[PDB]
Amino acid sequence: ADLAFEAKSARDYAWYDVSSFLTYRVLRTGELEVRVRFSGDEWVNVKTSVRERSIPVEPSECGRVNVGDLLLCFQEREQALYCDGHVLNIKRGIHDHARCNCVFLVRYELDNTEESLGLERICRRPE
Ligand SMILES: [Zn+2]
């Protein structure tokens, strides 16, 4: 499978699946930027704001997610964004391969807010 990407937006600081890359530019400051077309157009800093897409986690492999890990989290508010957070604590549940009822306490990177998310609402970083 070919590499797929997601890009951070400067408007809300959430991440979005990148459909394609159009062009690029260099700031007199030195930074390299790409113009990305999203799925479903921005200039994003390549170094910080573009990265290989996050991956969904299956119930039978929920054990690979540990305290301290970085995760793309579905943050649903009053507004539903996919943004970065770190696992602070994990409550392991009793379940099979069909569904994961573990609870993941996440601290969002932007504002250090905390939320209890289920596996269905998180994606891990590759590797
Ligand atoms: Zn689980």
Curated annotation (Swiss-Prot):
Changing Y82A: DNA methylation defects. It is found in: Nucleus. Changing D17A: Strong DNA methylation defects. Residues 14-114 are annotated as: SAWADEE domain. Changing F38A: Loss of interaction with H3K9 and strong DNA methylation defects. Disruption phenotype: Loss of DRM2 controlled DNA methylation, but no effect on CMT3 or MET1 controlled methylation. Zn(2+) binds at C62, H95, C100, C102. Associates in vivo with Pol IV but not with Pol V and this interaction is not dependent on its H3K9me binding activity. Involved in RNA-directed DNA methylation (RdDM). Required for the silencing of some endogenous RdDM targets and accumulation of 24-nt siRNAs, but not for the production of Pol V-dependent transcripts. Functions in transcriptional silencing through both DNA methylation-dependent and -independent pathways. Required for both maintenance and de-novo DNA methylation. Plays a role in the recruitment of Pol IV to genomic regions associated with K9 methylated histone H3 that are targets for RdDM. Associates with the RNA polymerase IV (Pol IV) complex. Interacts with NRPD1, NRPD2, NRPD3, NRPD3B, CLSY1 and CLSY2. The SAWADEE domain (138-244) binds to mono-, di-, or trimethylated H3K9 histone peptides, but this interaction is impaired if H3K4me2/3 methylation is present. This is Protein SAWADEE HOMEODOMAIN HOMOLOG 1. It comes from Arabidopsis thaliana (Mouse-ear cress). The gene is SHH1. The chain holds residues 125 to 257 of 258 of the full protein.
